[PDB]
């Protein structure tokens, strides 16, 4: 692995802010500002994917994620014709289990300081409208974030964004959800990422946790600034993000690649431990 | 040393088109896109200098650069109060001599491909209007670039920049030229960096090569979006770069730091070899 060499200046402030506000929290000894990315993905950081390495959003294409082995371009980014963009990102979670992933995705979302463990440089804020769900009885791990919305403030590039991420049952997009078990997929986190104000789509997002001998691998896909949720129409009266005068789908896709690899490789360093300490 | 983990999308295009066009030059074998920064400056990539670590442009301040040992914050960046920026950077050149540096600063400037050697991802073009100066007999190395103007197209961040660098004798800014020999300074590359059209000031630029026992060390200073050339009056009719909407002096200073460290650490990997091969 190799240490990150670029830290946008607003994020140099935020990481210090986060380090301080978390001082007394019990999980605070998980706060490590050190971030890195594995040697194996460096080619993906230096050149875009070719068009034929891009996965589509039809159920045919999506369900290709359930095949054993790997697809073309497991990790990379590129611009798309619309002015939209695409990111794929594989991240390994050795010595962790998909249940830890499931656990993690609701656990982090109720305290901002918890969120800042995940990316100490970029995560500023997170809240839900349903605090109750943290403690309610007889819910599985999935039931505590699937269906929910996370209102998030974070940096995915130079500037802070206010985004709303709603998680969905993958079957809603035509995923062969029943086939998840046999394909060794044991956790998922899929949904739409909208801008807080205009509700423009920043990303259709997929996270699939597939079991490996050492733990599990995360296979993630983002279709950036696309026109619609898969298997749905565009929302009437909401413009595509590609219409925003300065916006670049290609560059956003690159930032998403860098962000995703930084975020999830970091999580993978302390997920099995924070689970053992704060989970069931 | 650590490899660069961040490559703006336009530079990923430029490095490929740079590799293509150099293919068949006699110095093509020096083209290597692997870039890296030393462990010792990571601190400086993660947080800004405080203002008491910023050197001024008064001849009294500039001349501190001649003092034995180091100043505070030899390597770093920060915003300045008036929207301006500041970059300082130290880069080590083991097995190199200041004379190779004097040689390099003219030799590279006469073909765009030579320039691309220096930073394969960011250098797109260079031209000078005095091609005879390359082959005029009996000129010192310094006479081949001091007073000359290099018209440059390059990335210092996300977007190409068309700039013009005009190199000056350091005396012209109040530098105790007499003192250079005894301070171990055997080469210099100082000048004003102006924007192609507007002639707005992008940087006041100082590069000093001080002899070390392993070769030389390069000590660099940039005052970004400053108001005038040292020891001179602001040109009437030119706005300060800080007046352009969107310009962050602070952000530009950070880009300049990443850019200096990449560039000159890269130059250091091959300068002794290409001097031996293409110099005197
Ligand atoms: Mg995120
Ligand atoms: Mg340069």
Residue A76: strand, helix, or coil:
strand
Tell me which residue has tokens 């001091």.
Answer: B146
- Enumerate the residues of chain A whose CB falls inside 8 A of the CB of residue B46: 7, 12
| Resolution of this entry, Å | 2.2
Residue B77 to residue B45: CA distance in whole angstroms: 8
Helices (H) and strands (E) in chain A, counts: 5, 11
When computed from its CA atoms, the radius of gyration of chain B, rounded to whole angstroms, is: 18
Nearest residue of B to residue A250, measured between CA atoms: B9
The three state secondary structure string of chain B is CEECCCCCHHHHHHHHHHHHHHCCCCCHHHCCCCCEECHHHHHHHHCCCCHHHCCCCCHHHHHHHHCCCCCCCCCEEEECCCCCEEEEEEEEEECCCHHHHHHHHHHHHHCHHHHHHHCCCCEEEEECCCCHHHHCCCCCCHHHCCCCEEEEEEECCCCEEEEEEEEECHHHHCCCHHHCHHHCEEEECEEEEEECCCCCEEEEEEEEEEEECCEEEEEEEEEECCCCCCCCCCCCCCCCHHHCCCCCHHHHHHHHHHHHHHHHHHHHHHHHHHHHHHCC
Burial class of residue A214 (count of CB atoms within 10 Å of its CB; 0-12, 13-18, 19+): exposed
Any known ligand binding at B35?
no
Percent composition of chain A: helix, strand, coil (DSSP 3-state, to 5): 35, 25, 40
Residue A167: strand, helix, or coil:
strand
Contacts of A276 by beta carbon, 8 Å cutoff, 6+ apart: none
Any known ligand binding at B200?
no
Q: Do B251 and A4 touch (CB under 8 A)?
A: no
Cross-chain CB nearest to B6 (options A16, A158, A258): A258
Q: Which of A114, A67, A65, A101 is nearest to A188 (CA)?
A: A101
A169 CB near a chain B CB, below 8 Å?
A: no
Instruction: Provide DSSP, A121-161.
Output: TTEEEEE-S-GGGGT-TT--TGGGTTT-EEEEEEESSSSEE
C-alpha distances in Å from residue A73, one per residue of A69, A87, A90, A185: 12, 10, 10, 19
β-partners of residue A204 are A192, A223
Q: Which of A3, A39, A42, A64 is nearest to A219 (CA)?
A: A64
A254 CB near a chain B CB, below 8 Å?
A: yes
Any known ligand binding at A151?
no
C-alpha distances in Å from residue A176, one per residue of A60, A62, A105, A155, A182: 10, 9, 22, 33, 11
Give the number of C-alpha atoms closer than 13 A to the C-alpha of residue B113, restricted to the C-beta side: 14
Residue A52 DSSP symbol: G
Residue B44 to residue B78: CA distance in whole angstroms: 10
Mind telling me how many Å the CA of A253 is from chain B's nearest CA? 10
Mind telling me how many Å the CA of B82 is from chain A's nearest CA? 17
Cross-chain CB nearest to A6 (options B16, B251, B258): B258
Q: What are phi and psi of A181, to 5 degrees?
A: -55, -50
Cross-chain CB nearest to A46 (options B12, B42, B251): B12
Any known ligand binding at B99?
no
Judge contact between B264 and B104, C-beta under 8 A. no
> What distance in angstroms lies between residue B12's CA and the mean position of ligand 1's atoms?
25
Judge contact between B93 and B187, C-beta under 8 A. no
Q: Which of A111, A158, A162 is nearest to A134 (CA)?
A: A111
β-partners of residue B153 are B125, B162
* Strand B149-155 versus strand B160-168 pairing type: antiparallel
β-partners of residue B254 are none
Selected for mutation to probe chain A from B2, B4, B5 (highest A CB count within 10 Å) is B5
Any known ligand binding at A207?
yes
Judge contact between A104 and A275, C-beta under 8 A. yes
Taking every pair of Cα atoms in chain A, the longest distance, rounded to a whole number of angstroms, is 50
A1 CB near a chain B CB, below 8 Å?
A: no
Mind telling me how many Å the CA of B33 is from chain A's nearest CA? 10
């Amino acid at each position: 692995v190799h240490p990150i060499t670029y830290y946008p200046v607003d994020t140099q402030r935020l990481v210090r802010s986060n380090a301080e506000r978390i001082r007394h929290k019990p999980y605070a000894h998980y706060f490590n500002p050190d971030v890195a990315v594995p040697e194996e993905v460096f080619a993906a950081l230096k050149a875009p994917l070719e068009p034929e390495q891009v996965l589509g959003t039809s159920s045919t294409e999506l369900n290709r994620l359930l095949e054993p082995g790997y697809l073309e371009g497991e990790t990379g980014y590129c611009g798309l014709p619309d002015g939209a963009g695409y990111t794929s990102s594989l991240v390994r979670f050795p010595g962790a289990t998909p249940e830890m992933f499931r656990w993690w995705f609701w656990w982090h979302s109720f305290e901002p300081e918890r969120y800042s463990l995940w990316h100490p440089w970029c995560h500023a804020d997170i809240w839900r409208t349903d605090p109750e769900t943290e403690t309610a009885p007889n819910l599985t791990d999935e039931q505590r974030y699937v269906g929910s919305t996370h209102h998030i403030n974070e940096y995915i590039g130079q500037d802070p964004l206010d985004i709303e991420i709603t998680f969905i049952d993958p079957a809603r997009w035509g995923f062969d959800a029943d086939g998840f078990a046999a394909a060794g997929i044991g956790a998922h986190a899929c949904g739409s990422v909208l801008m807080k104000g205009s509700h423009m789509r920043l990303a259709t997002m997929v996270h699939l946790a597939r079991i490996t001998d050492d733990g599990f691998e995360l296979r993630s896909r983002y279709w950036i600034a696309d026109r619609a949720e898969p298997r749905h129409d565009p929302v009437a009266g909401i413009a595509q993000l590609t219409t925003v005068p300065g916006f670049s789908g290609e560059r956003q896709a690159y930032e998403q690649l860098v962000h995703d690899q930084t975020e999830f490789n970091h999580l993978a360093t302390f997920l099995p431990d924070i689970y053992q300490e704060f989970g069931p």
